[PDB]
Amino acid sequence: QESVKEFLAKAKEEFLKKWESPSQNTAQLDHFDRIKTLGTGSFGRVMLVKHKETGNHYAMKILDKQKVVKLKQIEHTLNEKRILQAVNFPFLVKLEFSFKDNSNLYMVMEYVPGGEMFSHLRRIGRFSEPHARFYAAQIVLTFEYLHSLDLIYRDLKPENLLIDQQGYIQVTDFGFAKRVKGRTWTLCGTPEYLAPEIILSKGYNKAVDWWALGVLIYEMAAGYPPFFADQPIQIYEKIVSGKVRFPSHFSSDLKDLLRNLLQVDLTKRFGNLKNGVNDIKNHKWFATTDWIAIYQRKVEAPFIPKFKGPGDTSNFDDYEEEEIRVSINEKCGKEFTEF
């Protein structure tokens, strides 16, 4: 419909203006009080902070420049910040400030107190098909938006989907997101969610996001992923065979959609045919979905997370609390000039 075409043309106009003139240096560390570590990895952390003058809460992602260089993530971290400051969509976490200092890179995002979908899925066991469908529709619309901007996301998994105060999704972690006209080649992502053409070291495209959507829908509805095994190399063998067994409680319509998303031949995979995303939106499994109502956030959610207020951390787990050091000397200044 022309209304969808004009929505996506305006979305691309607004993205390109910010993409071509990125914002820089819009706060500093001592404008915030540190509260709690919410997550930690090999080159960065995410901490709950409070802004000292306004009182507002944020999630502050802190990346150690020297560790980013050693793990060969320079280009990826520059991608992440330039994309996040240019996008705008209901189901994407919002970047409010960014800055850098002698030691670290900082991205300050809105705080989402409901926690990760991963926690709720493991607590409940599995989601009913209507519950899984509500979350899946939000991911279909978000990928339609990102792909129209020539962006590939490349890190879909339940840990990266936060649940907000209305029970809707906010997608976080753009560490592997990239603007790609054509193909790209980097090996990245989590093993259970990787498409076959990534495992086989091929030039790949946006079709890898539609494969990962098939993995996510299967995991939401079954409680475990389709290609499960104990070591990555065993997971990879199952993925390139693409032999998928479905639980008997799955509906016939769910099995049919998953066979077309978990298609090993990328030239036959739903999302990557002539009709694009509309082969997914018009599939029988989505026949009860009101796409406009989801976008407008007018549908009542299946589940509202339990929390006490905008500073509550009870839906995140506990980590050792480490210093945020800032060296007296500048580190890696050249490499991060554009940040």
Ligand SMILES: O=C(NC[C@H]1O[C@H](CCO)CC[C@@H]1O)Nc1ccccc1
């Ligand atoms: O963004 C969020 N988590 C993303 C990842 O960040 C770290 C990676 C450092 O390189 C550690 C692992 C974590 O899964 N949380 C987050 C974001 C916004 C609001 C509330 C929570």
